[PDB]
Amino acid sequence: MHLTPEEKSAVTALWGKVNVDEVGGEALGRLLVVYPWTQRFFESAGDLSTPDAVMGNPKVKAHGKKVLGAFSDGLAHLDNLKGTFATLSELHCDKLHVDPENFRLLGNVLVCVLAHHFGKEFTPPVQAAYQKVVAGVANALAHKYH
Amino acid sequence: MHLTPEEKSAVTALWGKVNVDEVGGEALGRLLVVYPWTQRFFESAGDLSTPDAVMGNPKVKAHGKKVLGAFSDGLAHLDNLKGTFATLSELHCDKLHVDPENFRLLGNVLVCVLAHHFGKEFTPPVQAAYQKVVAGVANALAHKYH
Amino acid sequence: VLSPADKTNVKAAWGKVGAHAGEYGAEALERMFLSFPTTKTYFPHFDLSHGSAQVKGHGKKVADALTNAVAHVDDMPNALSALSDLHAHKLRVDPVNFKLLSHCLLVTLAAHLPAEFTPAVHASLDKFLASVSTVLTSKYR
Amino acid sequence: VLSPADKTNVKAAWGKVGAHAGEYGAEALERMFLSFPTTKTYFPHFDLSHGSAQVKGHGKKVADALTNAVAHVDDMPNALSALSDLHAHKLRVDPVNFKLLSHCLLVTLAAHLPAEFTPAVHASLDKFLASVSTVLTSKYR
Numbered sequence: 404m405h406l407t408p409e410e411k412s413a414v415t416a417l418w419g420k421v422n423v424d425e426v427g428g429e430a431l432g433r434l435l436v437v438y439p440w441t442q443r444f445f446e447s448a449g450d451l452s453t454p455d456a457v458m459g460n461p462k463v464k465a466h467g468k469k470v471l472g473a474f475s476d477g478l479a480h481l482d483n484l485k486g487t488f489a490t491l492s493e494l495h496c497d498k499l500h501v502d503p504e505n506f507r508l509l510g511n512v513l514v515c516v517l518a519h520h521f522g523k524e525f526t527p528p529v530q531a532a533y534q535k536v537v538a539g540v541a542n543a544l545a546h547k548y549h
Numbered sequence: 550m551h552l553t554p555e556e557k558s559a560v561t562a563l564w565g566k567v568n569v570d571e572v573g574g575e576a577l578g579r580l581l582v583v584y585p586w587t588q589r590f591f592e593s594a595g596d597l598s599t600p601d602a603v604m605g606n607p608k609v610k611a612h613g614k615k616v617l618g619a620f621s622d623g624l625a626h627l628d629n630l631k632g633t634f635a636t637l638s639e640l641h642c643d644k645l646h647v648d649p650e651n652f653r654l655l656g657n658v659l660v661c662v663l664a665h666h667f668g669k670e671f672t673p674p675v676q677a678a679y680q681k682v683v684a685g686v687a688n689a690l691a692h693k694y695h
Numbered sequence: 696v697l698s699p700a701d702k703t704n705v706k707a708a709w710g711k712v713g714a715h716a717g718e719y720g721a722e723a724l725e726r727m728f729l730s731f732p733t734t735k736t737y738f739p740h741f742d743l744s745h746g747s748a749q750v751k752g753h754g755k756k757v758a759d760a761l762t763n764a765v766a767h768v769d770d771m772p773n774a775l776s777a778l779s780d781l782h783a784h785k786l787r788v789d790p791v792n793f794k795l796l797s798h799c800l801l802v803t804l805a806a807h808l809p810a811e812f813t814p815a816v817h818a819s820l821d822k823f824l825a826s827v828s829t830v831l832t833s834k835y836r
Numbered sequence: 837v838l839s840p841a842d843k844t845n846v847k848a849a850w851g852k853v854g855a856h857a858g859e860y861g862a863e864a865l866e867r868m869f870l871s872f873p874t875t876k877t878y879f880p881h882f883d884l885s886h887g888s889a890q891v892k893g894h895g896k897k898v899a900d901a902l903t904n905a906v907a908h909v910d911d912m913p914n915a916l917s918a919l920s921d922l923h924a925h926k927l928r929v930d931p932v933n934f935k936l937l938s939h940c941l942l943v944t945l946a947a948h949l950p951a952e953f954t955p956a957v958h959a960s961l962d963k964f965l966a967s968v969s970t971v972l973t974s975k976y977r
């Protein structure tokens with residue numbers, strides 16, 4: 404990444420306070436609600452007819468935890484996101500057919516969830532550093548598309 | 550910059566047939582005409598009120614030639630665009646205050662200009678080589694923004 | 696919005712396309728697949744090989760729709776309603792991809808209509824494709 | 837297109853903003869400048885330092901316009917004519933930038949209106965900023 408030691412520490416430190424379980428479920432659910440078209444990948448999940456139906460769907464919540472999990476582990480290889488997400492990048496392209504734009508939508512949703520959760524703590528300078536990570540993650544994930 | 554050898558050969562082979570003076574004037578003129586907002590940087594150029602006024606403006610022609618001039622040099626250092634474009638990136642940022650999105654619009658216009666000129670010679674695969682190139686250049690031109 | 700001038704421009708340039716629309720539609724797709732590989736994620740079921748009939752088939756359909764929007768330049772939202780519905784509800788193509796196609800459509804036209812692909816026409820055709828794209832995306836949320 | 841639920845959601849959320857809109861406008865710009873430094877190119881004449889009165893003042897201006905839009909949620913195009921003009925013919929901000937400010941605005945509201953920033957409210961505000969963005973860039977060409 405092009406993270407400043409100071410930027411690295413801010414990221415690192417807020418994350419320490421994150422419940423991935425809750426943040427993962429909320430980030431993915433908000434995605435399906437704000438940008439309804441991302442639901443194209445989760446038909447087998449069930450009823451996503453309403454915010455409530457989405458936010459409540461256990462399948463979504465569980466996928467959300469799987470996704471932030473992977474993200475979370477990526478924060479330990481912030482200096483080589485490319486290599487950390489290589490196999491995940493291939494899978495997404497070749498198996499899932501997930502348009503990389505989706506990675507960017509989520510990222511932005513992620514940031515809104517963090518702000519939502521930490522209020523005060525999620526300062527302009529802290530958001531800036533997070534914006535760099537989500538961008539970084541998305542690029543890493545899109546890297547192997549061909 | 551993932552230019553395969555064959556993509557690099559293709560960029561270079563075509564660039565040989567280009568009249569940078571000409572293409573330069575056309576690309577720039579056309580940018581001011583398709584995305585008139587871009588005219589914000591040229592209020593000292595005079596009359597840009599109509600297509601003919603833009604396309605024939607001696608100043609637009611002259612500036613177009615300059616821009617493409619710099620771009621052609623870029624094409625001889627496909628290996629080090631960032632390096633090649635560093636002082637230019639800084640100037641655009643710090644002195645000119647040019648939003649980098651401008652660099653991408655020009656890239657797209659330039660691609661249409663090349664299609665316009667070479668017709669059938671601008672094959673699907675050649676366009677894809679040039680797409681990577683315009684992108685690489687806009688990225689290099691934006692590298693020093695802060 | 697599209698101005699009288701714009702409308703004249705579009706009818707004119709598109710006029711020239713005539714019977715080649717089909718082929719120019721297929722070519723714009725190929726160009727798009729090659730330059731923006733991420734767009735491929737929407738056609739996992741297609742044979743994207745060079746000269747693929749599926750692509751041929753699809754280029755024709757896209758062309759017909761464009762041809763239909765030109766014929767109904769004064770009532771595109773209505774002329775394209777059905778297609779706006781399909782894209783919003785079934786296909787659910789991310790909005791960013793319209794601009795990529797638009798772009799490849801413009802390169803394709805440029806490559807075929809040197810005499811008509813003037814600065815003025817280029818601008819008109821770009822506003823037009825932008826408008827089609829907006830209609831097709833209007834019912835997304 | 838903003839649904840009635842949407843208009844409701846928006847007026848509620850903005851209802852809560854109240855006397856803090858200005859501070860939130862100011863905060864959103866600050867967040868924009870730091871996260872997307874390319875946005876700074878449009879404010880060379882400003883002191884973009886933290887707590888600058890130029891930024892503060894501008895923040896108020898933006899907030900107010902938003903208020904005015906919420907108030908005329910039914911007639912935005914008309915309520916924002918002047919502003920659409922200014923941006924299209926004077927400021928000429930590139931359209932991509934509207935998405936960046938919109939985003940920083942959500943982030944700001946989320947951080948300040950926890951209880952209110954529900955998933956349904958989030959969706960509505962987004963659509964809303966989108967429409968505001970569309971209005972402000974409608975006379976560009």
Ligand code: HEM
Nearest residue numbers: 441444445469470471473474491499501505506509540544
């Ligand atoms: C932070 C970005 C993302 C990360 C780190 C990520 C990671 C993952 C992981 C770890 C899996 C597990 C699959 C396996 O190992 O077999 C997965 C599956 C999947 N992801 Fe991604 N993902 C991301 C973004 C997205 C987005 C934005 C979407 C669509 C909105 C998406 C759609 C899917 C789907 C459809 C599956 C398949 C799960 C199944 O088999 O049901 N992903 N992802």
Ligand code: HEM
Nearest residue numbers: 587590591615616617619620637645647651652655686690
């Ligand atoms: C391939 C992308 C570009 C290249 C290689 C390029 C190159 C150049 C060069 C070589 C100069 C003169 C340097 C000097 O004055 O010392 C220049 C100046 C300038 N460029 Fe760029 N340019 C590019 C894109 C653009 C775009 C897209 C815009 C605006 C839409 C722009 C706006 C300007 C302006 C306003 C000047 C100053 C001209 C003057 O008033 O003397 N440039 N550029």
Ligand code: HEM
Nearest residue numbers: 734737738756757760761778786788792793796827828831
């Ligand atoms: C102005 C631009 C576009 C036009 C005019 C257009 C028009 C059409 C038409 C006429 C069809 C066939 C529907 C039928 O079966 O009758 C179609 C299908 C489809 N389009 Fe769009 N489309 C556009 C943009 C896009 C983009 C940008 C994408 C993705 C990159 C896309 C993805 C698809 C897919 C995946 C199908 C289904 C094809 C099949 O399964 O046969 N479309 N479109």
Ligand code: HEM
Nearest residue numbers: 875878879897898901902927929933934937938968969972
């Ligand atoms: C949510 C969309 C936006 C709204 C409602 C908005 C509203 C306004 C308002 C109310 C003004 C002040 C007019 C006056 O001075 O009388 C203004 C000016 C201005 N806006 Fe926009 N704006 C928006 C988006 C943007 C964006 C995204 C940018 C650039 C990144 C921008 C750049 C400017 C600039 C440079 C000025 C003039 C500043 C000065 O010299 O005082 N605006 N805008």
